[PDB]
Design a binder for this molecule. Structure first.
Ligand SMILES: CCCCCCCCCCCCC/C=C\[C@H](O)[C@H](N)CO
Ligand SMILES: CCCCCCCCCCCCC/C=C\[C@H](O)[C@H](N)CO
Ligand SMILES: N[C@@H](CCC(=O)O)C(=O)O
Ligand SMILES: N[C@@H](CCC(=O)O)C(=O)O
Ligand SMILES: [K+]
Ligand SMILES: [K+]
Ligand SMILES: [K+]
Ligand SMILES: [K+]
Ligand SMILES: [K+]
Ligand SMILES: [K+]
Lengths: 43, 270, 237, 243, 194, 237, 270, 237, 43
């Protein structure tokens, strides 16, 4: 496989090949107090 | 800050679980009021088996979602010239995609497809030379086909032919800002309380493209389509997606509606 | 996820005995401008406790015809205490927030409020929005199109933004801590509102016959970790 | 000159191609990347957030009211409350949700779904309801007895206002089509099943209390959900260039 | 530093357009001059070195150096206040409003000149070089005003000239930079030169 | 004792090319309230550059009938910029000053001004002083009894207080740095004026026939090392 | 010599300063009479904060400013031939740029765009072969389309077609001088006190380009545009930029004016 | 930056007691032709003190209608002393300069002169310049278009070239040291003028009624570090 | 990245990629006597 740059500016580069995902916690559970799955949420 | 974001390349496996008869563990009980999404997992609601899941997550990355050309402009010359303001609100598809993020930084690949058409809009097999000049704000804009501005000693120009493959150039992240904004709850200038200056990020406007035919066509005209492809995408703060039709090219104005999906007879009939 | 809380900022202390945890937008608490992000070269002003405290706004009544109400930030406090003074006298402003929405009824009432803070929430249901709706002041403005969120999106998907719910059977308050968000290191506090705070009723207020029917909704906001640049004379939009 | 032989494909403009191309401003230097909260790297982070389902899609329901499932004191037992197809990408209650908008941007999906329900009656209003997921094979169940033979959860009203019903990924194939368009592709082959709700006992209220209350319906993707093959969202269209 | 064509009024022709006029007052706190600090827009700064080059680019960033030199007689004294008002409203209306911004009080003497640094205070890392509004709505970028006022008064001995001149210099500071080259708008032609 | 100076505070810079050294009252520069002197228990506000900069007041003309003029501190700036805002919003205030008096003429003029800052300078030449004389605002007030200093003492002995002279043949300015003085750790900025700044002519303005006769006196003051306690709503005397 | 020139790749940072009440340091006091530019810095005039400034300086380098193609010639054949004298005073944009330096050395990239046009100047879709020959001074210049000089055994020629991509060649730094001069206060020859021989650097004239069509066109003609791009730029002694219009192709002659910017009502109104 | 100076070259010494430092064009003092730059193969002549001294030219009166005056180099000295003799007898010349412009008035006068040395300053305000303006001799020529610098540029931007100002209140002289500049190692001193020295009034001469009105401007120039090649008989343009 | 020459003469080479700036002192302060910022220029 080959990924070598021909042009001067990075805008000429091809698409990024690092397509992963990350933990959605900052969106799905942005709370201060931890609420474990095994526990009741409101105590 | 407080919540960390780990990185992964495959969706989560399923591991074998067993039955549970207890008063200490109640994973099914939740409280949506907190602002949190349920955290009850498969393994806790039913007895599961082991499943080594290798399904990938690549095609939903910002780069895989945004990384492909889409139409942003289409027009014909009138007198061998045409001036288009660089803005992506004319065509709704790529527009609705960009508005899924609040802020974003990205480079772009512009592909230009041109061909000659007669007065009745019927394509002609005619190879003619054309020029595309990027005129930043503050630079003198050409009045017509042969004005002096097409000397283009500083402004970038691309000259190709309708018989050559489509033209294409890459463009860097050019805003004065640290990211482009796709939602802006503010005004364009100080001392203006007018609705006509609301919701426009002026730093998102970097000029215009002026197209011409190097020499005059006799009875025909240049038909141009500009495609744009985001590259190296970086985005922040995902937004609630567009659920109503676009009306204006420059603003998000819309017409209220009372439902999104079509109705059905009974809530108990699937 | 405890159900009680005390919030103390400056010379003001707030308490609730029926909360439902506390949300921190995007998992980020308010932070100051770093030297590598900054561009304005002048030494900033940092008011401290004079501007970073709790300001209570005039209450809104949860009427029968109630669709919701919104406040823009920093617009809503643009004229309160030393926070507002500092906002007017400086060209540039940066800052986070601590929001506490209040609404108690009784165990004989039922109703549910969505309490959401949206970054860059445009009020674009009109071709030429009126300044009184984009910048409604401390009294805020009423919702006319809650289903389409006043911006052409689905109210139901507004949960993609930092939020809590005030479900009368469960809690009498919602608490949110918001960080500064913008595509800029700083901006003008009079020409741009970074956040919008909306309280929209999704389940109507109901109660057992004869119960109190006059139910207010009070909003209390506190600037947090603020800084200002570009001092001159006072100016408003 | 180095001997070359150009091949089929030459000159073509494939919108998904990925070549390096000369930059228009070779020496340009962009502004710095500053610290901004809430960065997203993959859209799977977004479909994992719960959003409201427009479940009450009936003539009588307009606006905000289409998000409310109606409960009320019964005078009969084992009755049905609601029913819906769990398929996330087809037209109906789920198309205006986050999960739906994104499922509709792709042609295939896979994964368990998170269906969370929150009760909004008064603190004194009690009740027990059974929520069930019926796997493919026939039609939605006709009575509670048939429904409870599938995957279910019995929900008890109380301080913890909500309950989750996980519709686990049970499929013959690793992926399903996002549409069930049948007249051409015969994609009804992919139907994922039904989700029905029934009274387990009854909704009981004290004297003079409201005899009807509301349930809100949340939906999100589980951690093992993924989408494949991007396609244009069918709900975004226009008749001509915007003015 | 190059000279600013600050006296751009009908009555001023040629070399005289470089002279700011001072004169013995009989009233206090009066205004001497006013100008927008934006280096790339039409006006007094477009014929300067800073301006010609700012006009060859589309975006700018940095602190500006505004140096003033007094040219009255050795016996002519005075104190003037020069201020930089950041964006938000219009140019200040009186000395009181002006001194609430960034300023320098200048005392006439052996050291003939004084510098007023208009520091880079902006929301964004860069600004547009034009404030063309009708299309791009670029008035979004206005950088502010620079006004001059009498701090005390210009005092002269008997029979001396009662008016004297101030010359205005401008340059970029060491943290100034330009981005995106474009054609200078002032250079044009109607056809190939003979 | 150099004859030139530059004073830079906040976003304001002042210069003079004919000074006569700089006086520091009682040899003490402004200092903050120490923990052993303090009594008010609340965390103080410290505005920084927003209030600690140079404010120029409207000029006074050295007329033929001129007896002098005075300004009370902090009264004179009680309504200027964020310094004044902070003064009004807080019950308690503490702070020092940097004073720069300006008056240039020519080498063909002669005259001499006493520039003095007096701690607790009472304007008691009337049985019931008028608020307009005890608290004259930013415009200050004119002297009616300069010989008895408006307080029953000898003008000649006013040199026991921090001062400089503006002798036209020698200098065109006077510069003073004043520390906070009071029998209290802090006090109210609206009910008590700690210092008074007076400019009194002791040798009349004279000049060679035909010389400029319009000679102003400009005063420029800067709060320095200030701190405030007891925040509430804005209040003036 | 005495003043050294350090090299840098980013603009200067801003470091935090504090107040100052002194008689020893007066940075604000300057003396423009010396010939020096003020050296009062940000940190000395106001209280500043720390700012790590990384804004680059690349696009203002000689190479980034000059390094792009610009129009230097445009013409049509008359009898299937045309002779152009290599000089850049015909079109003002690139000319005004070069005259920002007094002396400069640079290589050049010439791009030639050609197309056929009829008598009414309407472009034709006609692919014809054309020849461009560089004729140095002293070499015999072709009188017409088929003279013997087009054998071109020594003179460089480029032969391409109006249907092929534009032609392009690089050219070295060719003057007899050690740099090209863009201002010359002298005469072209000894014993000439005439105004017609003033201000022309003869060593800046390296010949002419003669264009022809290899075979005759029937009723049409070759329309040619020559672009030139400086490369590897070296320059000395920056000049006061052009502030008045060009009139003559070969000299800097101009028409006096009494103002540069437009007037305004009052000097006190911004 | 001292205000006094003495310049001694050869048998001539110049002094001034009111200077404003000394400018060295482009930071480079005059230097001889190096062996790697040279092309003319003959051993050069180096006159030394006979040609490298100060030559004073006839004075010009700063009249009321005065627009400025210019001298071309080496044209202005092309006929003075042994420097001029050497210039005529050789085909090639190379050399630097030391320029001293003089203009004293009194402390009762005001006016400001720009003293600039421009490399390759073309006098192109006419289609066919007259030899008397391009090469005006030792008497130099008067400015007709000072605002456009006689070359289509802005007078205000002439500060991009080596210069000083003679501001009567500050100095009575300007001093410049210029190095040789050309795109050639050497050139002809009769066919090309490398530098032009202009004295243009930007602030008109004014004074107290009755003061001396006859104010001259004297220019004194010295060749420095010169060398000549290509000896033959004498020849002028 | 790749920067390798194909042609014989250096005039064929691509644009120089060394775009920096240098101290402007030879233009902004070409004086003999040093005039420090903290000092008065004329003494
Ligand atoms: C010479 C080839 C033509 C190259 C054109 C370069 C133009 C520069 C690209 C600017 C892209 C920024 C677009 C950002 C935001 C959209 O306009 C938004 N929809 C406007 O709100
Ligand atoms: C065969 C392809 C054609 C190649 C043409 C090569 C011509 C040689 C290029 C000479 C470039 C020198 C230009 C220098 C200065 C300008 O002419 C000035 N404006 C004249 O004063
Ligand atoms: N600037 C040229 C026209 C430009 C072109 O046609 O390429 C002229 O005025 O003649
Ligand atoms: N030298 C040739 C003509 C050159 C050509 O047409 O290419 C001849 O005299 O026949
Ligand atoms: K896995
Ligand atoms: K749980
Ligand atoms: K979940
Ligand atoms: K740096
Ligand atoms: K200094
Ligand atoms: K400077």
């Amino acid at each position: 496989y080959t990924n070598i740059n021909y042009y001067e500016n990075a805008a000429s580069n091809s698409l990024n090949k690092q397509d992963f995902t990350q933990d959605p916690e900052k969106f799905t559970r942005p709370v201060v107090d931890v609420m474990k799955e095994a526990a009741v949420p409101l105590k | 800050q407080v919540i960390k974001s780990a990185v992964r390349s495959t969706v989560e496996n399923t591991v074998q679980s067993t039955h549970s008869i207890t008063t200490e563990a109640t994973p099914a009980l939740q409280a949506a009021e907190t602002g949190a999404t349920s955290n009850a997992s498969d393994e806790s609601m039913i007895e599961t088996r082991n499943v080594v899941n290798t399904h990938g997550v690549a095609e939903t990355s910002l780069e895989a979602f945004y990384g492909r050309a889409g139409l942003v402009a289409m027009f014909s010359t009138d007198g061998g010239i045409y001036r288009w303001y660089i803005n992506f609100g004319e065509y709704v598809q790529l527009r609705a995609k960009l508005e899924l993020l609040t802020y974003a930084r990205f480079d772009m690949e512009f592909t230009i497809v041109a061909q000659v058409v007669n007065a009745q809009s019927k394509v002609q097999d005619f190879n003619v030379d054309y020029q595309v000049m990027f005129v930043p704000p503050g630079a003198s804009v050409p009045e017509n086909q042969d004005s002096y501005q097409w000397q283009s000693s500083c402004n970038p120009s691309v000259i190709s032919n309708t018989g050559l493959p489509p033209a294409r150039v890459s463009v860097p992240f050019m805003s004065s800002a640290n990211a482009y904004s796709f939602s802006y709850d503010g005004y364009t200038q100080f001392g203006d309380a007018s609705g006509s200056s609301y919701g426009i990020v002026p730093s998102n406007y970097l000029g215009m493209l002026v197209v011409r035919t190097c020499e005059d066509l006799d009875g025909t005209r240049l038909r141009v389509r500009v495609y744009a492809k985001p590259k190296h995408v970086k985005g922040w703060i995902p937004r609630s997606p567009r659920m109503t039709p676009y009306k204006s090219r420059y603003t998000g104005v819309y017409t209220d509606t009372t439902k999104f999906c079509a109705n059905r007879a009974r809530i108990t009939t699937a | 996820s405890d159900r009680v809380a005390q919030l103390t900022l400056g010379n003001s202390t707030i308490t609730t005995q029926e909360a439902a945890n506390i949300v921190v937008g995007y998992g980020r608490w308010p932070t100051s401008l770093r030297d590598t992000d900054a561009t304005a070269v002048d030494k900033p002003t940092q008011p401290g406790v004079s501007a970073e405290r709790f300001y209570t706004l005039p209450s809104v009544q949860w009427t029968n015809s109630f669709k919701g109400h919104y406040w823009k930030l920093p617009d809503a406090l643009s004229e309160l205490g030393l926070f507002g003074q500092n906002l007017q006298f400086h060209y540039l402003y940066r800052g986070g927030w601590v929001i506490h929405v209040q609404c108690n009824a009784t165990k004989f009432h039922q109703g549910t409020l969505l309490v959401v803070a949206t970054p860059e929430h445009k009020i674009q249901s009109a071709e030429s929005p009126a300044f009184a709706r984009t910048n409604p002041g401390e009294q805020g403005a009423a919702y006319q199109f809650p289903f389409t969120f006043e911006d052409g999106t689905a109210l139901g998907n507004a949960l993609i933004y930092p939020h809590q719910w005030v479900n009368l059977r469960t809690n009498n308050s919602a608490t949110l801590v918001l960080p500064y968000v913008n595509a800029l290191p700083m901006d003008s506090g009079i020409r741009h509102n970074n956040w919008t705070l909306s309280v929209i009723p999704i389940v109507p207020l109901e109660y057992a016959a004869g119960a109190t029917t006059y139910v207010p909704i009070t909003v209390t906001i506190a600037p947090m970790c603020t800084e200002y640049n570009g001092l001159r004379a006072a100016v408003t939009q | 000159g180095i001997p070359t032989l150009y091949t089929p494909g030459s000159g073509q403009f494939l919108t998904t191609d990925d070549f390096q191309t000369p930059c228009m401003l070779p020496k340009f230097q962009p502004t710095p990347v500053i610290d901004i909260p809430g960065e997203v790297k993959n859209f799977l982070e977004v479909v994992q957030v719960e959003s409201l389902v427009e479940i009450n899609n009936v003539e009588s329901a307009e606006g905000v009211a289409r998000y409310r499932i109606p409960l009320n004191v019964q005078d009969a037992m084992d009755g049905q409350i609601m029913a819906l197809r769990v398929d996330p990408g087809i037209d109906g209650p789920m198309q205006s949700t986050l999960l739906g908008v994104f499922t509709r941007y792709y042609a295939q999906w896979s994964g368990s779904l998170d269906f969370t329900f929150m009760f909004c009656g008064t603190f004194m209003t009690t009740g027990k309801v059974i929520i069930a997921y019926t796997p493919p094979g026939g039609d939605q169940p006709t009575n509670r007895r048939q429904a409870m033979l599938g995957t279910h959860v019995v929900w008890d009203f109380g301080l913890q206002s909500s309950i989750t019903l996980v519709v686990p990924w049970i499929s013959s194939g690793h992926f399903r089509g996002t549409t069930l368009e049948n007249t051409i592709y015969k994609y009804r082959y992919y139907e994922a099943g039904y989700i029905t709700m029934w009274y387990q006992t009854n909704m009981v209220v004290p004297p003079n209390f409201p005899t009807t209350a509301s349930i809100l319906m949340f939906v999100a993707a589980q951690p093992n959900f993924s989408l494949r093959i991007l396609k244009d969202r069918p709900d975004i269209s226009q008749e001509g260039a915007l003015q």
